Design a protein around this nucleic acid. Structure first.
Lengths: 167, 60, 165, 173, 210
RNA sequence: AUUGUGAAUUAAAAGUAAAAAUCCGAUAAUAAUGGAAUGAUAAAAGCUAUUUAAGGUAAGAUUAAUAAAUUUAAUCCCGAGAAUAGAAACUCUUGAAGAAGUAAAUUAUCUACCCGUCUUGAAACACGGACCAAGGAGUCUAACAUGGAUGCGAAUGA
RNA sequence: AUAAACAUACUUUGAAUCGGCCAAGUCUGGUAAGCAGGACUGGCGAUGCGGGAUGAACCGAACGUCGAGAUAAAGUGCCAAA
RNA sequence: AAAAUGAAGACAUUUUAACGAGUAAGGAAACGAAAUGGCGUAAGGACAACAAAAGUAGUAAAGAUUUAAAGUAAUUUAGAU
């Protein structure tokens, strides 16, 4: 035979839309077409982020969008994830393109004079991406990450899943 | 029922399947336990430089 | 089956060099170590206090912190299937400056001498010098001609066996 | 078996680079011949391949491969006991031919494989200097013997029939 | 439009003529040096070869980890696989270490020509594409000033400036079977075996192997 | 005490030092003539013919000067690119009186130790198994965690 | 210098497993053992194929279903292809 | 694995390249370029002659015995009694 370091195994990268969502299937069909034809790194990025699992597409709040759009007045924030609403802080005027908008987030963005776009309108208006800012939410804020590891560790102890008689 | 005590057979073959995990770069850059006076000087300048950086931000 | 003492199997490792007993040179305590330097850990049995563990003997490490009496050294240690970072604090008596970068610092200096000439030469507009050639493994030597005027021949043949008794 | 003429020089501190080593090496090819040459240098002059340059390696062809000569070979071989020096004589028309006989003859009479024999020298001796008990009889002028019990010869493999017809016979030949 | 095909064909001829000039001119210079040295009675020392072709002789079973790594560094991962290797202190020591598993020597130009023309291939986009045109060679090695198959042959034989990049693109050759040795492949070629350094005699083996 | 052979060496003649045959070295390649396995059928970056001419690096040829030359000059020859024109559609045998293939039985050459399990190792002189049918063994409730799909999101559930 | 993008760095969750055995240009106890125990590596276990008549470990070589060739260990009086 | 094409064709697309041994063990379902592909048993909700009589059945169901066909295989299909 042949002395290979390792045998061929499936590459651990998603290439389609997870689940049976008919609309999310068409979005991947649209951006898989755009990235192949336009050969734009922006469409390759949006296509890749559309294929992540739900846990890997964390939310972005209106407060975080406002901070990132401060020095970008006429721009379009583009986050492939649900956009929630931070009720603690005001929402300025800005245009956001996202997969889904919370009822309160959509009201707040619209009431400020902004716009809530979907990814087909963004591809229709800015296919290769010209006045957009790519944004993704934080991943390590998940509480599940606290318990990972060994809680007896000297350096970075875990968080000891609560249970029988935990003090 | 005497049994074999210990053997290092096949141990190196195991340790190299997933080879020796080198530490990342951040391991070598830790500063815990440095010289006391050196940390004081570094903290003093980082506080001075940050305040100067911040007042310009407040100015504009 | 050895024991688990801190200084086991050190009859030969911790022995002082032949005719090298007593005090050490004063260069050991006078040499100045700076953070980022390369040092070699060399346990000195004559100074029992602060003796580094025998597994670090002869290991080349980097200085990461300099204290009033001790020099912090950062070396690599091998564990089950990984490599960990060990940070120590040894007195200067148990370490020694390392020459691991001795020849590298000559090549760094030679290229700097050429670069300093190149900037000047470009100021006068004259052509600039080329950088020194990189080291190569011993290359196949080229063809050559040998003048036979000063050439002598000695025949080579198997030798008749002679008894050593 | 072929004979080669090999020369080389040593370029280092120990040996001055104005002294050239020569040898005449018998080997099946030039690659084997060079290996014998390098071991002679290494075991007799502390010369190694990594610090020496080969110059020439040319075959030596027999000048008149039609004249019968009595060859004498001085060799040393290693047995179970120790190391001994032997002097065997062969009658052939080529130097490489005589060495081929010597290797075959030593492997049979003494059961010594080739990698125990070092050919010190091979020369040519006179007609009356042959001392081999059997070979001494064929060096005279009036050698004459009837080869009896000849098996009949076959022109080629074409006529090598398995079963023949009629009776069989040898030849007083 | 497609007028570049004629210009490309002309350009290839110009390169081919130039390459054969360099090979023949260096061949002549050596020949006269030997001739003149004999006239003067002097001694002429030939230059050591700069190119080596190595063939993997044994299987993939029963190899020490040190030997296993070296054969992977030389891309000899299969029995009856030949690659071209530069000659220096590093590689010669590496080939000595794996001597029982390889046989190697110094190829001739005709050996390089036949191997590249018949068994040649290139790694394009991770695909071992066999050589069928100069356009595929121009695409892969255009940045290295190798635009036809004769630049590929000339560069390998003379070991030019871009030998590493050209050689690393050439996929390891897959060869046939042949009579490996006289006794067996368990002894060195010096003893009449199969492995080891065969010097120029590796061309006879490669003749029955290509 | 006249003569014979003779390795080796030498003179003169012949010889520009490429015939053929054999041996010793070096090689194994281009080609041709017959086949085999898997295919294809189409016209060309086929092949051929006519024009000019990049080239022929020991060696396409003849010459001359000279020569242990892959040393120089001349004029003959051929000729790559390119432009212009040319050409490939076939025979025979067998088959609903059974072709090709496939299946069953028998024969012949090669080939084949008892399944399951414990075990480093069983075809084992280790254990269960006389044969057949039907039944026959990771399920349900409850708590937690990870993970993939789902709704909503400072709320979610009610 | 050489190799490396289906490279590299991983993160999470989890299965089985920790009765082993053999070889040797190796070692210790023993008179010695197809004995007991170890260092390094390759194997058998988990592994069929070609050869050694037969064989867990030896030699070549590791396996999708096939056709044609050149081979390896090793062989060429008949069984048995040469 | 990478390129190309992609509302429906179809054989789970087209091309190129590398690869395919294996005990214990793992790879749940769904995921158009599909994050392994499938066969079988029984029951529940649907669909099954698109023009107002809409799957098969006394012009012979299920079952049983065999003969052939499809599938690498689990199995399926059809004829005869």
């Amino acid at each position: 035979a042949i002395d290979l370091d390792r045998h061929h195994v499936r590459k651990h990268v998603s290439k389609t839309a997870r689940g049976n969502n008919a609309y999310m299937k068409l979005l991947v069909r649209l951006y898989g077409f755009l990235a192949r034809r336009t050969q734009s790194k922006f469409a390759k990025t949006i296509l890749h982020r559309l294929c992540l699992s739900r846990v890997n597409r964390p939310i972005v709040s209106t407060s975080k969008l406002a901070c990132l759009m401060k020095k970008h007045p006429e721009e379009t924030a583009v986050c492939v994830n649900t956009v929630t609403y931070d009720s603690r802080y005001p929402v300025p005027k800005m245009n956001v393109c996202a997969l889904k908008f919370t009822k309160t987030a959509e009201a707040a963005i619209t009431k400020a004079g902004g716009k809530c776009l979907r990814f087909d309108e963004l591809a229709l208006k800015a296919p290769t991406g010209r006045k957009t800012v790519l944004i993704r939410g934080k991943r390590n804020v998940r509480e599940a990450l606290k318990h990972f590891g060994k809680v007896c560790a000297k350096k970075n102890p875990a968080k000891q899943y609560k249970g029988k008689q935990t003090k | 029922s005497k049994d074999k005590n210990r053997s290092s057979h096949n141990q190196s073959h195991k340790a190299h399947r997933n080879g020796f995990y080198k530490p990342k770069k951040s391991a070598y850059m830790s500063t815990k336990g440095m010289n006391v006076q050196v940390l004081k000087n570094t903290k003093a300048q980082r506080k001075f430089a940050l305040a100067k950086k911040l007042e310009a931000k407040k100015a504009a | 089956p050895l024991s688990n003492g801190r200084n086991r199997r050190t009859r030969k490792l911790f022995k002082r060099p032949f005719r090298g007993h007593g005090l050490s040179n004063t260069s050991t305590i006078l040499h100045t170590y700076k953070v980022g330097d390369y040092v070699t850990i060399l346990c000195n049995s004559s100074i029992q206090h602060g003796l580094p563990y025998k597994a670090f003997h002869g290991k080349t490490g980097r200085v990461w912190n300099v204290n009033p009496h001790a020099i912090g050294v950062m070396v690599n240690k091998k564990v089950n299937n990984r490599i960990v970072v060990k940070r120590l604090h040894i007195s200067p008596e148990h370490i020694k400056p390392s020459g691991c970068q001795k020849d590298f610092l000559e090549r760094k200096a030679a290229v700097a001498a050429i670069r300093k000439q190149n900037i000047q030469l470009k100021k006068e507009g004259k052509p600039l010098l080329p950088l020194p050639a990189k080291r190569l493994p011993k290359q196949p030597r080229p063809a050559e001609l040998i003048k036979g005027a000063d050439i002598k021949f000695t025949t080579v043949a198997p030798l008749k066996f002679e008894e050593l008794y | 078996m072929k004979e080669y003429y090999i020369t080389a020089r040593c370029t280092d501190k120990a040996h001055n680079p104005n002294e050239i080593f020569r040898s005449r090496v018998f080997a099946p090819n030039y690659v084997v011949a060079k290996s014998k040459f390098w071991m002679m240098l290494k075991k007799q002059h502390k010369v190694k391949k990594i610090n020496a340059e080969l110059l020439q390696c040319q075959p030596i062809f027999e000048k008149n491969p039609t004249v019968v000569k009595n060859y004498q070979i001085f060799l040393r071989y290693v047995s179970a006991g120790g190391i001994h020096n032997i002097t065997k004589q062969y009658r052939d028309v080529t130097r490489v031919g005589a060495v081929r006989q010597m290797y075959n003859d030593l492997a049979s009479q003494y059961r010594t494989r080739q990698d125990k024999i070092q050919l010190i020298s091979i020369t040519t001796v006179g007609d009356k200097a042959v001392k081999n008990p059997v070979l001494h009889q064929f060096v005279g002028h009036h050698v004459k013997f009837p080869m009896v019990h000849c098996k009949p010869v076959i022109a080629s493999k074409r006529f090598n029939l398995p079963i023949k017809a009629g009776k069989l016979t040898t030849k007083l030949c | 439009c497609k007028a570049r095909c004629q210009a490309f064909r002309k350009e290839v001829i110009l390169r081919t003529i130039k390459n054969h000039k360099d090979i023949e001119a260096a061949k002549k210079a050596v020949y006269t040096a030997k001739k003149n040295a004999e006239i003067n009675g002097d001694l002429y020392a030939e230059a050591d070869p700069k190119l080596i072709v190595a063939i993997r002789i044994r299987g993939i079973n029963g190899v020490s980890p040190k030997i296993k790594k070296i054969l992977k560094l030389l891309r000899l991962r299969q029995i009856n696989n030949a690659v071209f290797i530069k000659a220096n202190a590093s590689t010669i020591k590496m080939l000595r270490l794996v001597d029982p598993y390889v046989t190697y020597g110094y190829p001739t130009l005709e050996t390089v020509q036949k191997l590249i023309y018949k068994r040649g291939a290139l790694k394009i986009n991770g695909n071992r594409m066999p050589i069928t045109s100069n356009c595929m060679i121009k695409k892969a090695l255009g940045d290295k000033d190798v635009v036809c198959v004769d630049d590929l042959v000339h560069e390998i034989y003379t070991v030019g400036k871009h030998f590493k990049e050209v050689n690393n693109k050439l996929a390891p050759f897959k060869l046939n079977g042949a009579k490996i040795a006289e006794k067996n492949k368990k002894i060195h070629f010096i003893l009449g075996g199969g492995f080891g350094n065969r010097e120029l005699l590796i061309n006879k083996l490669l003749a029955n192997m290509i």
